[PDB]
Amino acid sequence: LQEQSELMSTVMNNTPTTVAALAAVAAASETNGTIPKPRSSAQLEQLLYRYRAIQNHPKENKLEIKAIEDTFRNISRDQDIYETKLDTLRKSIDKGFQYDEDLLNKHLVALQLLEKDTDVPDYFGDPDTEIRISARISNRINELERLPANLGTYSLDDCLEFITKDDLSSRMDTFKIKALVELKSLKLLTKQKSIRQKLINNVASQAHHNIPYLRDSPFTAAAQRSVQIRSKVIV
Amino acid sequence: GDDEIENFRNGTPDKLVSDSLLKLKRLRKERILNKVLKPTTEERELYFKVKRILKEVILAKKVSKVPINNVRAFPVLQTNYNGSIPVVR
Amino acid sequence: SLPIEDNYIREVVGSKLMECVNDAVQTLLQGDDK
């Protein structure tokens, strides 16, 4: 029941002592299904620091402090495990390898693309897969629609302009225009589809009056002749 | 911790970079073909393995370029204000 | 002329004999000995 987020809700409301999640076997163990060993760098670790520092004053009504302090031993162990492992890494480096740049070029580029979830080229009908396309399109629109409207830039080239306290430099909206061309073209997609429907079905529905090798074919020139045969009059 | 790179740094360090990004690409292909969005814990933990390899080559081996290709800009928040002329209904 | 969903296409979705025959008939129509 989001035990790692209810502590964030109690911290953001500035009242993590008046309730303090009411830690028993019925409440502290129901939202956990021992605390579940949180994942973030410090966004869920600084919460447990303040949660222990607040529950230092009751210190006996909440039995889950032993479960929190056991993971405090595991955090200090795995940091100490890594700090010995980082030291055994930095000695196990061969003094000559000469890491190749054009593979590190392919390693800096492909890592940067795989970070923010885009398709990486290697260089090393069917409505089932139609929903899997439109679920990534609607994924992008709902990600563009959570950015703040007051987004501004800062290039490294403004120091030649000597911007004063109130100067209104002209490079402030070089990220804001690109975020609204992207958000609005992802809504006019079925609009260019209707034009491309009206474009393809207007240039290809004839297909034998402009294309020369098709209007100079035997079967088409005979058929266009055959449909223009006027009826024979009887007597 | 590390648990694999100390054994591998005695030989080449770049082969685990090549073999794991293919696993990152294959798991991402399995993520798009499952209509899921969040990355798995198996490839996120595998992601911090790759960044630790290239960092120590820049740290200790000190690669002859470490190429700088930056956009030389970064998004920042700017202030906002309503107008001071009052509303007319 | 705008690729909008073209990346989502690329995200989810990743002869010679008769030419030499037409070459050979081109060689038969040069020498009348053939």
Binding site: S40, L113, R146, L151, K178, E182 | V76 | P3
Partner: peptide
Amino acid sequence: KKEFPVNLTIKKNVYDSAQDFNALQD
């Protein structure tokens, strides 16, 4: 070749989501 450009400076990081820019962190 006309290609739609990749905007990595706007894209939030997916694997970590803690090394984003401070305007893109909420």
